[PDB]
Design a protein around this ligand. Structure first.
Ligand SMILES: [Mg+2]
Ligand SMILES: [Mg+2]
Ligand code: NA
Ligand code: NA
Ligand code: NA
Ligand code: NA
Lengths: 1021, 1021
């Protein structure tokens, strides 16, 4: 037929028209399986009426839709390959994925898209049983197609669809034939729907979610809604189920809804069709509402995800079953009352994270195994909520969240971040239909899931009248869930919750017309009463999450600060192979994509392979459900659970003196929700030996759960007990170090040890143990670090951001400053040799820093170093103040007394505990995909590496990579281990920040602004 | 091109798809003229850039779209006729118009329409000047096409459109050629848009509004909005004008907005493009907002429609004009505060009427002359508001309302009355795009008109979530106007005003789920605070508007009862010609249309030719802006104007004794808005003669206005002054009437007069003056009337409504009751002859009525009749209790002392005044298109017709048509004058009702429920 040809179908250019978002697409609805057996529906066994078309398909790539030959509609192309479906065709190397943050990947000219529009032609040959075509309705379901597509069946045009993130269904009953059938799908990379899909993520395309065939009878269940109502104390519930049908109504038709708790039927109801009168013309003859009473229902929550099974039966009066549908039911009430978000009558505290659907190998194709891995990792790290940023997810995600227990914010697939202004489309009534489809079809698909507690209207689209209209539509159709939206300043008329992104705890950010007030100040603005839940905060880009504890202190102090969603869960890195088949993680620009936003795609708490970043432990500690207070010998344990008793918790305490255990014990936890338990410790040891006594408590779950193993640690806390200062005089050795003075250097010898101080540079240049040199590079002051992602921000060589810390440091000359020797003197004491040095670091005639040191080598072989540094008040505050050297030794393990075991920084050390830690050298380096300063351990009093030992009170990192190499290397796989080991010992280190990664975010109390600094070290063997 | 062919264009069947409401249609906007001269824009002179295509077109009718030959796209069909455009093709006899009230004219199966879909093919050959195609944009504008259409230009497909009531615009720049061009428009009668167009009106089709070409420059004004803000006392105003452009932005571009009051420029402003920052991405570079201060602005209102002229200039910095646009500006503020609708700080009282766009000859094609005639008639009858029921009107209507002064409710073209339930579509998200287009494009077109004070979401579509969404969209885009909607019970979340239809003053109507509470009770329902303005009330079907005074008493007593809109203005009758070219008014079913709703299309206050019905005077009197109170000799005049002083009003008073004037005078009116004026009358005459003194006042406008002639009467009132009862004995004549008794009759003779009473029937059978018989039918009791439309309701022979008054009367046998003579006796008195009669009216053995009479013929020739009637308490209350006869006389004039001059009934007589009235016999018959009881005059003490005179206290009507003929005749043109004159003299008459015309609406105080009745008459010559 001419009308089925490509020349006719493509002529209207439906993908450059916001007025046409679909053609011949069926209505949205909750998940259906069309069970013909009620027991199978109840037990959720696979349905023979639902058939997966996933598997091997034929695929051909074209640069534009006009390049597809007409013969593709009739037979498979000879050049076509065989590919796995679902998939993204960028993951098969057909064209490159594009990573851009805010700028659209195409020329901004709505609704038009470039003529060179990459086109993917999918096709499948499949058989259909004759029973399916004898009677009933056969539909095909595309769970997701990016970004738009035309559909042919046996050469006849079927329909068109947009909104890559929601299912598209088409009736194939009039197109299918008995035996062999062929499906032809033409997928377009760009469409007018792409203007509503400007999320900060990789831009891919293809049939990236499941494809299936569903067979329904002619008389069928077409929609069903489940609602729960409760009394004041939640002891009585009414389960209201509205069922809708299509087909011929007959007086013998009946609907039965039965509720099951496991194997036991709790409630049931049967009724003929015909609803109550609603207006002058009557009621719905094709609908019925059944109300089931449930006594003492088991309530659903993230703490205890109690679920019931509701089965909806369509049957005749005699008793023969026509069709069955089922869904999991969670009894829970969500509402905002007096400014607080309540779940089952109790105020929530959202321990949330944003999660994109990302896999380093399969792109944006999701699988049950990855979903379960993510959910278990989140729950094991004290997360209780997830934001579907920024689109409806794969349908199995909501089922798994129902089952395991996580609150879900379901978000419409609308983001127009790149528009200027941001609301240019969302304030235009001509785009209201397209926006409305994306909201309404999501609600229609997901409104039955108990895990979904909040709807979101999208992300970063400004504030337009369409937002207000769709907010009100949701409030009318589903009053059971609050609606939130951040655009337009996060407190507009289109949101029930103040939901800002990256608003800071105490600091105001008064931007024009969309200020980000401090969250504490925001609550008290005149006339403001809503709760505040950050939809994004604590931007976890690289070495980040500095200041997380401040957020959680505020969340616990202020009732209307009910938490937030960290940005974000997993790095969006992709895997590439070099010349040796070795994989390496890639970010923006690594696929030839341009313009790109480089490493801003990696903001996760876990790597793309789901291994954790160090910041995850900080998040876990701050988000823990047990809070602790110490008063003398008693421990006060406060529970932050709202519904469950501590029936799987054992408290273990340990007392150690500078790392060596002295006493320990175990006490079972029995604390009610939001209750307290006082734990009286026995008479703790009081050693007369010098050192600090430390008490450490940890909560252990003795029994495995659905989401954790036996012995899982869920919370911990540490305190300092009594301290005994050391007043013992050092052992007076009889040997005296010998000083030899040449015009080049001072040489100090004691036994087999030797120290050399270069007199022209003023630094310790070499150290000998026997005849073995210990240093590859002299011991020198260091004031800089390889810049973090938070240090760099949005700055780059093309667009310099002068406010970024790295740019201020570079302009001030911190990285190029040259040390000028001021003095270097050697003196012999009664029992030691004293070296005094002074240096000035200068850049273009300006003295940035002055370092004055004293080296005291005594008869015991120990070298005591005192450092006093002055920092010019008008230079930017330095990243660190310390020493560094390249040791010749390469040892296998690192042992230290201090905060650990994981890397920690001054504004990100609350999760770390003081103890004796011993790790392999490799664990002392954090392999961030974008290399930077990493692996620091703070609060360290002793460090052991090979024969060397350093003592004092310092921060350190130790690795095979110099700060220079880390700074100059753009990818972690390009790093090479240098000879020996680089040691950085810092008296002082600046915070890492992380409130956001595009502006300075290190709070004042963690900047090195004091002007004068002092620290001491003891180096011995 | 194959893609331009009918076979390809019609294949997608865009008219059976709610997802496609247009293709390639330009954005909506306020009216544009693209003036290239600012003085021409200011003076509103015709623009050479706007060209009307109205005139002679070629037209061909087809039964279905598939019947149109392909050659129509290239050349005009040989069989095509030449027709005038705009027009409705049913008005040219191509197919029949259909009148149905609620039932859809097609099978209800959305979105599908019948295959036999009448199709009208329009075409026009026109020239285009080469200057228009050298540069700029040329667009075609279809102001209205019913109901959907495809457009071709020079054989190339252009686009598609729906929503018959709003303009559709298409860019023809790439399709036009120099010289001869051809336009081809295929209009379809039915589409999926028809499901949203179920208004109670004739169903027509075609290009029924103007068609024009507009030429714009490439850089152009694309939209402009005008908003007025005020201080607390309205003495300072800020005129805010937002201007939007399309085309290439250049730094030299400027926009100037100037405000003019007649010939004087009041304010001006100039600015380059670029708006303020609105969100993170910036502001609109293609928009500018200019704020002009106006001191002491002249405010707009229906009382004083002060208007300014705003001119919007697009020009370069040097000063050359690119384009100009203009609109009339009315400074006024509309808001609801504390439950009251306020205009310029004062609470409105809406004297409204619903108005369809209807013409008896041109169907639904409107013209300026008819619009002006309607506006003048409305204002002359004390109306101040109009509801555009139920769709956006022709654009000139809003301009005329701005100019003359009338508040306007602008209503979206959405009515789904026939759906079951009524919200089946409006609660479906799949119809949200189609509904949103109809709301948003109306707002975009009309938001600048000062006369529009309220938006309406449509009519009778139930209540669905789409209503709430669109309500909120309007509230977001245009906060300056309240939003109202009646569906779903008239007090839903989608309306700012309680706006019920046909809610009664005191009586509750508690329907399930959508009750119509009495309006007084509705205001005080727990938690209700909004104002109440009936969107429809006082259904004026035929002889109706009984009980109107009750509504207006309530409106004046209750502050939150702020009026309503009468249903409706003009009868929707159409003109047909019989076998002699004589026109006659036709209603539903007269065109072969079936099923139809007969005479329910005629509900107007005026006939289709705009001649008034009698009820219009009642409305005018009740709605008058001056209220009166009498206390002794002083008249208290209260002004109901809110803004204007009574600077064009003179009060005339007159005192009459039983119709003859005794004193009169004139007093100028000087009363402030909402003020009072006491008028002291001189020492009024005190005649000793018998009779009732009546005081009549009338307010006269000495000076002509824009809407009225000099001497126009705007208000009036009457009171009874002192009465002197007659105690004079009658003149004792010496002649004695002579009684002759035969077995057939009693014969009374006095001089040349003779009376005959038939002794077998018991009635006066004949009367002689000389040798001339005076009666054609005997004088007999009458208890029935030819049923009114309010008596009939929805009852018909196929579907009997047992509750209707006519059905109750028929079932009780009132129309078939047979009089049985009980007694008939003649006695001779000292100076008179006495006749005593008694009758019983029985039906199937039940005595319905008993009448006992006394006839006393004295020596003066007068016949005194006393009547005493008993009505069975269990029979339905009769329509009247009186006498009737057929006089042989046909006299030219009727003279009576009583209420007049126009027809009046017991519940519709407040406008009538007691006086001596003299009219031709023809004026005593009201020619309702559907014949019924008509022409009654109440409160009559004397009636003169030919030689006869009747005296007493009675109601009467007199005409050439019997009640039987009126009852049995369905159209007024089928009535024939009977021989002689039919007289109905009633002691008592039932009210006519009219709160609605589909249920009994006559209030209890106007039903004849007393059980016993007495009245007396004196018949003399
Ligand atoms: Mg489109
Ligand atoms: Mg359509
Ligand atoms: Na809180
Ligand atoms: Na990012
Ligand atoms: Na009132
Ligand atoms: Na009607």
């Amino acid at each position: 037929m001419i009308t089925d040809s490509l020349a006719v179908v493509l002529q209207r250019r439906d993908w450059e028209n916001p007025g046409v978002t679909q053609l011949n697409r069926l209505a949205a609805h909750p998940p259906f399986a069309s069970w013909r057996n009620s027991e199978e529906a109840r037990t959720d066994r696979p349905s023979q009426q639902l058939r997966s078309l996933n598997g091997e398909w034929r695929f051909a790539w074209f640069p534009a839709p006009e390049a597809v030959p007409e013969s593709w509609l009739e037979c498979d192309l000879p050049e076509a390959d065989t590919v796995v479906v679902p998939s993204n065709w960028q993951m098969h190397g057909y064209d490159a994925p594009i990573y851009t943050n805010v700028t659209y990947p195409i020329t901004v000219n709505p609704p038009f898209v470039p003529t060179e529009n990459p086109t993917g032609c999918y096709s499948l040959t499949f058989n259909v049983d004759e029973s399916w075509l004898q009677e009933g309705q056969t539909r095909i379901i595309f769970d997701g197609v990016n970004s738009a597509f035309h559909l042919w069946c046996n050469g006849r045009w079927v329909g068109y669809g947009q909104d890559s993130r929601l299912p598209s269904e088409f009736d194939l009953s009039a197109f299918l034939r008995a035996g062999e059938n062929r499906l032809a799908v033409m997928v377009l990379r760009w469409s007018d729907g792409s203007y509503l899909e400007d999320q900060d993520m990789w831009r891919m395309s293809g049939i990236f979610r499941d494809v299936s065939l569903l067979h329904k009878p002619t008389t069928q269940i077409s929609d069903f809604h489940v609602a729960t109502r409760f009394n004041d104390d939640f002891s009585r519930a009414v389960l209201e189920a509205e069922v809708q049908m299509c087909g011929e109504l007959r007086d013998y038709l009946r609907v039965t809804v039965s509720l099951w708790q496991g194997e036991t039927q709790v409630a049931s109801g049967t009724a003929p069709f015909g609803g109550e009168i609603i207006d002058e013309r009557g009621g719905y003859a094709d609908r019925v509402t059944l109300r089931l009473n449930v006594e003492n229902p088991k309530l659903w929550s993230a703490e205890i995800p109690n679920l019931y099974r509701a089965v909806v039966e369509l049957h005749t009066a005699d008793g023969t079953l026509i069709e069955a549908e089922a869904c999991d039911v969670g009894f829970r009430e969500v509402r905002i009352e007096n400014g607080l978000l309540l779940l089952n009558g109790k105020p929530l505290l959202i321990r949330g994270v944003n999660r994109h659907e990302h896999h380093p190998l399969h792109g944006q194709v999701m699988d049950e195994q990855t979903m379960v891995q993510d959910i278990l990792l989140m729950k094991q790290n004290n997360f209780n909520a997830v934001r579907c940023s920024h689109y409806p997810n794969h349908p199995l995600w909501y089922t798994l969240c129902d089952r395991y227990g996580l609150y879900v914010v379901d978000e419409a697939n609308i983001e127009t971040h790149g528009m200027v202004p941001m609301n240019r489309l969302t304030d235009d009534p001509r785009w209201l239909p397209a926006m409305s489809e994306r909201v309404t079809r999501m609600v229609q698909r997901d409104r039955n899931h108990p895990s979904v507690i909040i709807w979101s209207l999208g992300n970063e689209s400004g504030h337009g009248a369409n937002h207000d209209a769709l907010y009100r539509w949701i409030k009318s159709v589903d009053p059971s869930r609050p609606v939130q939206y951040e655009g337009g300043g996060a407190d507009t008329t289109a949101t029930d919750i103040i939901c800002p992104m990256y608003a800071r705890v105490d600091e105001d950010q008064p931007f024009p017309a969309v200020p980000k007030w401090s969250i504490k100040k925001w609550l008290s603005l005149p006339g403001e009463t809503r709760p505040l839940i950050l939809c994004e905060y604590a931007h976890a880009m690289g070495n980040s999450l500095g200041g997380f504890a401040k957020y959680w202190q505020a969340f616990r102090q202020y009732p209307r600060l009910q938490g937030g969603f960290v940005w974000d869960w997993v790095d969006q890195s992709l895997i590439k192979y070099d010349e040796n088949g070795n994989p390496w993680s890639a970010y923006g620009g690594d696929f030839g994509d341009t313009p790109n936003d480089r490493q801003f795609c990696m903001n996760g708490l876990v790597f793309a392979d789901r291994t954790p970043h160090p910041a995850l432990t900080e998040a876990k500690h701050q988000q823990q459900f047990f809070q602790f207070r110490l008063s003398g010998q008693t421990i006060e344990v406060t529970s932050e659970y709202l519904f469950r008793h501590s029936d799987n918790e054992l408290l273990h305490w340990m007392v150690a003196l500078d790392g060596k255990p002295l006493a320990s014990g175990e006490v079972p936890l029995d604390v009610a929700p939001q209750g307290k338990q006082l734990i009286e410790l026995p008479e703790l040891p009081q050693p007369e030996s010098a050192g600090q006594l430390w008490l450490t408590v940890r909560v252990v779950q003795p029994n495995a759960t659905a989401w954790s193993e036996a012995g899982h640690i869920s919370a911990w806390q540490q305190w300092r007990l009594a301290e005994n200062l050391s007043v013992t005089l050092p052992a007076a050795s009889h040997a005296i170090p010998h000083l030899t003075t040449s015009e080049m250097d001072f040489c100090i010898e004691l036994g087999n040890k030797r120290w050399q101080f270069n007199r022209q540079s003023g630094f310790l240049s070499q150290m000998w143990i026997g005849d073995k040199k210990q240093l590859l590079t002299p011991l020198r002051d260091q004031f800089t670090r390889a810049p973090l992602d938070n240090d760099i921000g949005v700055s780059e060589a093309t667009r310099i951001d002068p406010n970024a810390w790295v740019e201020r440091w570079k302009a001030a000359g911190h990285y190029q400053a040259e040390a000028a020797l001021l003095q270097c003197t050697a003196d012999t004491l009664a029992d030691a040799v004293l070296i005094t040095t002074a240096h000035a670091w200068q850049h273009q005639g300006k003295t940035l820093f002055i370092s004055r040191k004293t080296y005291r080598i005594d008869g015991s072989g120990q070298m005591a170093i005192t450092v006093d540094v002055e920092v010019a008040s008008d230079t930017p505050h330095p990243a660190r103040i310390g020493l560094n050297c390249q040791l010749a030794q390469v040892a296998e393990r690192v042992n230290w007394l201090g905060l650990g075991p994981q890397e920690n920084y001054p504004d990100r050390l609350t999760a770390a505990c003081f103890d004796r830690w011993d790790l392999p050298l490799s664990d002392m380096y954090t392999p961030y995909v974008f290399p930077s300063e990493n692996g620091l351990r703070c609060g360290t009093r002793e460090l052991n590496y090979g024969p060397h030992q350093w003592r004092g009170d310092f921060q350190f990192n130790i690795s095979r990579y110099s700060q220079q190499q880390l700074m100059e290397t753009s990818h972690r796989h390009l790093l090479h281990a240098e000879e020996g080991t680089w040691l950085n010992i810092d008296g002082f280190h600046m915070g890492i920040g992380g409130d956001d990664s595009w502006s300075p975010s290190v709070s004042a109390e963690f900047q090195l602004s004091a002007g004068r600094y002092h620290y001491q070290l003891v180096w011995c063997q």
